[PDB]
Amino acid sequence: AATPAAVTCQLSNWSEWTDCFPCQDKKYRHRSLLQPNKFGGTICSGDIWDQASCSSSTTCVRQAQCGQDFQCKETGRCLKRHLVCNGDQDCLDGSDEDDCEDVRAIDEDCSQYEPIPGSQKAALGYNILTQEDAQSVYDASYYGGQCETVYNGEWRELRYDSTCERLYYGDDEKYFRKPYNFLKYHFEALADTGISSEFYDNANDLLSKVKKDKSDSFHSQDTSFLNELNKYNEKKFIFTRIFTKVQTAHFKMRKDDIMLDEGMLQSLMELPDQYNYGMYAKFINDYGTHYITSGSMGGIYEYILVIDKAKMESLGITSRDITTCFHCKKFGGGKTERARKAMAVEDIISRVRGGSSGWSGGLAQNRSTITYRSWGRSLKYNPVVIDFEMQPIHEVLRHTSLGPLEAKRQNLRRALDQYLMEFNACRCGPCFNNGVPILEGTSCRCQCRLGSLGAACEQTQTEGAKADGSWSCWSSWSVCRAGIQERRRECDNPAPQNGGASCPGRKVQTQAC
Amino acid sequence: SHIDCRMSPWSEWSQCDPCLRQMFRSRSIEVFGQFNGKRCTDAVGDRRQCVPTEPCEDAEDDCGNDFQCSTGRCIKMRLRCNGDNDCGDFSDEDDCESEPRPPCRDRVVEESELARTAGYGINILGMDPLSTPFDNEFYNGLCNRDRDGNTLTYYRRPWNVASLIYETKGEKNFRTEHYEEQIEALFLSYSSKKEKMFLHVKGEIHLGRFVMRNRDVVLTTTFVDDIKALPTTYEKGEYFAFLETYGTHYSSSGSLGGLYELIYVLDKASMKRKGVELVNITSENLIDDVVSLIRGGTRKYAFELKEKLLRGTVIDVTDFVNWASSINDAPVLISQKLSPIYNLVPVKMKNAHLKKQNLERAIEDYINEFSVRKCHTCQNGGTVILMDGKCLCACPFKFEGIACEIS
Amino acid sequence: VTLMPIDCELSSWSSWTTCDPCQKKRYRYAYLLQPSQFHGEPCNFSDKEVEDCVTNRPCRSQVRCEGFVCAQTGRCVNRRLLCNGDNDCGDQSDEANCRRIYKKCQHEMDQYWGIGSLASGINLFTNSFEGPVLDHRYYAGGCSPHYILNTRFRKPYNVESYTPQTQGKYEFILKEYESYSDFERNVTEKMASKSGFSFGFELGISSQSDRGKHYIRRTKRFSHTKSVFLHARSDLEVAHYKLKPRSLMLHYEFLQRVKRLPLEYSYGEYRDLFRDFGTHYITEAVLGGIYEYTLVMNKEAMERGDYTLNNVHACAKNDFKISLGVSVGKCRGILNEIKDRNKRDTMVEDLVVLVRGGASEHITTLAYQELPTADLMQEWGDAVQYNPAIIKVKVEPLYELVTATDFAYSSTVRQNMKQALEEFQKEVSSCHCAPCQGNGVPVLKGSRCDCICPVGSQGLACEVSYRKNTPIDGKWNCWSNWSSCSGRRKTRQRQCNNPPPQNGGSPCSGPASETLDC
Ligand SMILES: *[C@@H]1O[C@H](CO)[C@@H](O[C@@H]2O[C@H](CO)[C@@H](O)[C@H](O)[C@@H]2NC(C)=O)[C@H](O)[C@H]1NC(C)=O
Ligand SMILES: *[C@@H]1O[C@H](CO)[C@@H](O[C@@H]2O[C@H](CO)[C@@H](O)[C@H](O)[C@H]2NC(C)=O)[C@H](O)[C@H]1NC(C)=O
Ligand SMILES: *[C@@H]1O[C@H](CO)[C@@H](O[C@@H]2O[C@H](CO)[C@@H](O)[C@H](O)[C@H]2NC(C)=O)[C@H](O)[C@H]1NC(C)=O
């Protein structure tokens, strides 16, 4: 297939300005992304979202969001008053700890233990369309005046006192303070390894030779026929997979009274109770489509090696020769042809998620007792989120201290339903040759595996290889004429190029009117 | 012939900008100077001193109850007396003489260099990173300590960087392909031998991602000042010079890391050819092509590995580890999420929205005005390339020349 | 299409329950009818719904505390536990405003390593820890000297013993098997015949006929099979833990969540309770670590080789001489030759390694494919002291913590928990899922089901493997409903994965049918 053409990124006209929000003095408007730039071509310089200063002509009547609870000046966080002067700055304002005459208002003597390292990523939102962290959803630094600690089972750390010759383990970091949002943070050292290795090698050879000769002479006649065929076939296949998954933590996020991040809190209160797609779209784009509520903290290594070699060689030759003598005359003719074809293809992917750039690179280069041990050591210090569960960004609202918010929650649900089918990677065009389409902001890429090059991964150093189809985007919803609505999608973006897998899911979708 | 580049007439002069004491002209680049014509190095815009026709509508504003520094930035009072330099030239701290209270109470915290550089400016034209427009030395009075992760040194995350997570990854990806054929057969006849080999190796290391704060973001004084010193009218050259010095985008998020890559390709063919018209030919050609690339890490290890990589020498993992460890000292922005630079133009500024719009339009014109689209076609369909101020194309085949005009 | 994503289904709502007199709320819930699987759509996280109420009736006040009330927590604590020098509240209320604090535990004392893990409840059906249910930092005095080596510990009030009953069992079994068999033949035929006549008579006549024939056949066949089984396991035990039988001090969080349980039965709330804290708590456990290594090698090579040859010759010459002379030499032959060779080499290897307890350095180096050095096994077992796994567990269901000492309507809550737990065991079973391919195991994971694909299998359903066929183990479908009372019975069709296909593996577990008194 020849290269597809560039398209220019294209946006709809501006929606009208929202009325100037009384507490914010800001107008907002959105465009919608009518086309990303796809296979190169002019990117939009226009953003999808825009905001402008504007005096509202009307006061922030709603500013009294909270009463008896202590509300910070900078930010709508409303604290249960025992937290005021509790010794911990429970909002960025710090006003809850300002002018505190009563030092004995401090809740507890906890601060010697620092927060769990790496606990912050569990806070961050997640964007399923880009697999990227967002802004914080949870307040990763909030303790609610509590002093829940966590026994760090890896606390042992060798120390040598030269003056004593004592060789001992330094007690430091024996415990960590658990942030309030974490229901649990179970340190639990596990490892599981799985290897498979399969070798299939077959070689076949045939030869077949015929001679057919007749001589009849007195005048002399002599006829000879030869037919010979040789045909060689060899197929060699090696596949080996190594999955070594190491775990050091299981963490779970409280389902009750989730203390939203201050920035999230503000951004949320700013949303109108009326539906405005641009506002909620911006919210999702900032905090992500999804927030996380289950975790393991780990290192992972995966090694895959696939080698196919095939060689086929054939020779065919025939001759017929004939003779008439007594003057003498000689003739002959026939067919002969010769061919050899051979190919080998080999690839490896070695990837490590885990706790040090140096040793995780080393282990990505070189598997051994040395790289496994030193990478395992490094996982002591920089473990990584190895698996997580998540929920739509809107479901937090049900679980917040704030209450129903149900207008906002339904608005956010609608907005999400749209956004997931506006900024969807499917709308980037056909990435050939198992390239992965990616839509970042208003722009598309195809990420190409190493066999492929070019804007669409279209050109390949070899001429044809099994590559899979992928879905087109969903069509628009039908009109629902009955109480039911339809939507349609085809496995043609691209079609399976060389009889790769047809893409598995539904061809047809249907919906309540 | 070569085609000498061409430029528009000057625009009309603008009116005098009453606060800027200046008037301006625009000049489109009609033709880039294909085929090694005259380079169009001349400036796309021009400006002249003017005695202003009307009084300046001042660019200063009353920050009210906010502290107004020696520089134009205004900050909330609690940031005075932090010990931290929350403004320009400690003016928020020189405003303070007694009862200093660091938010890093009773402890010392390292300044992270990766945090300091986060938010790199980017120019879309070659995606060159410019310096961060963010003032990453502003903590807003917090002491959020994070480990370097590759080291136990704890560093204070600056206010602008919502996240800096050492989500370390390492990868090696390898592929080899080998193909070989031997073929034996007015009329034309030929017999041939053919062999194709491709080898592709790249490795990636990821040191961590920064995410810049979506909101409440505090910028360098020079950046905001350069938005103040901007014509309010659309003035192609003045916004182009702004985009050229700050870039049309910033990384709102990015991954730091290191990267290496090696490509090897060999193609070998042998042909014998005989033709008759109502000749005998023997030919051998070999093409062997190797490229080696490394990005990031300290020069010593980076280059030692890259040379040892380029040779068939087997790399001792110790040197690869020494490079991957030194990536902690000299990272490279291997990826970013790009937001238009005008999203940093702060709301609550004089003509803020208008300057936003004008930057949007200037970026439009800049993409367009330096578009290769207006170069002449390649004669053999090779890639047209826009050099600095001249345009050409290149082709890999035997068809060759400054426009591939011959073969 | 082979796969077809199946979306989550969950029932219509229950009725609203009546308004809870204490919670001044009412509740509604739904059952998960079908977990989402194979990238199906997941249902909204709203299997529970809640409403507020008018206080149609009052209810009992919260249970009287005869002790001191910890201000923030409201932990009822004994007045002897004030000015104690210990926080018994989870809060400073006990020690707040004390004129003199009498430090009892003046010495340097550590907590028992991992003791706070054991205070976590477990989901028995998942065997996975959940929220904290017991407060193992409550000491209630104590301060008896407990030592391990030179390190002295302060035991929690809840814990009866934590004692270093060290033990270790290693187990190594290596089985190598070889067979080869070789078969050859060589076989040859040659035939030669001559017949000629030559006579004088004048006249002369001569004739000669020549015949040659050769046949050759060879056959070769070779089979080589090489099989290795290597299973190694280390069971290390480092401490014995037992919880006290009685008067346990619950964790605040669990306490409160219990306090919020509705007095009327509505499954959704006890479900959420188990999903937060699980179903059971650990009364007695053996703490230590596991290492287990299991390698399987099968190397099978076969060669077949055949050779066939035929040769035929004929020449005849007849010559008659009387001057007159006439002769004909007539000769013909065919050669036939066939060679046929077929070779196959197959190697199938799989390894699984499994480690629990100890430091990540040792855990991962043991997770490499090589059997360890005795030194690294020593280092691992040293580090298991400080971060052990739980090898053996003896558990009691969490309702046994619900005690009148803490909760109004204790009996009612207890009974509700029994009922809810019984329903929960049904609703969380893996039996509900559609079967994996590829001998995959469906692990239900909340509202969606994940196939844990074995070593050598890949994809959402483990549908990708290079192995053509491999034994599929049988999997039960969900046990039937309770048979109507004339006696009580259930049945299991052993169907959900068919045991026989693809050289089907083990049949399912027993029982296929289960029967009871009503
Ligand atoms: C077609 O041209 C061939 C070379 O272009 C030629 O091959 C040459 O033959 C020479 C002997 O006659 C030999 O010494 C020399 O090395 C050479 N071989 C090669 C590979 O170039 C062919 O003979 C010629 N064909 C005919 C029919 O003359
Ligand atoms: C991984 O890297 C190590 C270190 O460079 C390699 O160790 C060598 O191993 C070979 C045997 O495989 C020995 O002959 C060398 O003496 C070893 N060198 C050192 C410094 O110990 C190892 O070979 C590498 N393994 C792989 C698979 O690349
Ligand atoms: C079939 O004939 C071949 C050829 O003679 C035999 O193989 C030879 O055996 C002799 C004696 O063992 C060796 O000295 C030769 O080197 C062998 N040659 C080859 C090519 O194998 C073979 O053993 C015979 N097989 C049977 C079943 O009779």
PDB file of C-alpha atoms and ligand atoms in Angstrom, chain A residues 366-368, chain B residues 316-317, ligand 2:
ATOM      1  CA  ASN A 366      22.070  -8.701  30.085  1.00  0.00           C
ATOM      2  CA  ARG A 367      20.153 -11.304  32.076  1.00  0.00           C
ATOM      3  CA  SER A 368      22.295 -12.939  34.750  1.00  0.00           C
TER       4      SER A 368
ATOM      5  CA  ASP B 316      30.600  -5.602  28.844  1.00  0.00           C
ATOM      6  CA  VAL B 317      27.417  -4.861  30.814  1.00  0.00           C
TER       7      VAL B 317
HETATM    8  C1  LIG D   2      26.255 -10.729  31.046  1.00  0.00           C
HETATM    9  O1  LIG D   2      27.313  -9.889  31.456  1.00  0.00           O
HETATM   10  C2  LIG D   2      28.353 -10.533  32.200  1.00  0.00           C
HETATM   11  C3  LIG D   2      29.347  -9.458  32.573  1.00  0.00           C
HETATM   12  O2  LIG D   2      29.861  -8.806  31.419  1.00  0.00           O
HETATM   13  C4  LIG D   2      28.976 -11.651  31.372  1.00  0.00           C
HETATM   14  O3  LIG D   2      29.875 -12.362  32.215  1.00  0.00           O
HETATM   15  C5  LIG D   2      30.800 -13.156  31.444  1.00  0.00           C
HETATM   16  O4  LIG D   2      30.268 -14.439  31.283  1.00  0.00           O
HETATM   17  C6  LIG D   2      31.077 -15.285  30.447  1.00  0.00           C
HETATM   18  C7  LIG D   2      30.360 -16.612  30.355  1.00  0.00           C
HETATM   19  O5  LIG D   2      29.025 -16.446  29.896  1.00  0.00           O
HETATM   20  C8  LIG D   2      32.500 -15.405  31.017  1.00  0.00           C
HETATM   21  O6  LIG D   2      33.330 -16.049  30.058  1.00  0.00           O
HETATM   22  C9  LIG D   2      33.078 -14.037  31.367  1.00  0.00           C
HETATM   23  O7  LIG D   2      34.296 -14.193  32.088  1.00  0.00           O
HETATM   24  C10 LIG D   2      32.090 -13.255  32.212  1.00  0.00           C
HETATM   25  N1  LIG D   2      32.618 -11.937  32.525  1.00  0.00           N
HETATM   26  C11 LIG D   2      32.650 -11.434  33.763  1.00  0.00           C
HETATM   27  C12 LIG D   2      33.233 -10.059  33.899  1.00  0.00           C
HETATM   28  O8  LIG D   2      32.226 -12.059  34.730  1.00  0.00           O
HETATM   29  C13 LIG D   2      27.915 -12.587  30.799  1.00  0.00           C
HETATM   30  O9  LIG D   2      28.505 -13.474  29.855  1.00  0.00           O
HETATM   31  C14 LIG D   2      26.788 -11.809  30.116  1.00  0.00           C
HETATM   32  N2  LIG D   2      25.725 -12.713  29.713  1.00  0.00           N
HETATM   33  C15 LIG D   2      24.961 -12.512  28.636  1.00  0.00           C
HETATM   34  C16 LIG D   2      23.911 -13.549  28.374  1.00  0.00           C
HETATM   35  O10 LIG D   2      25.109 -11.538  27.907  1.00  0.00           O
END
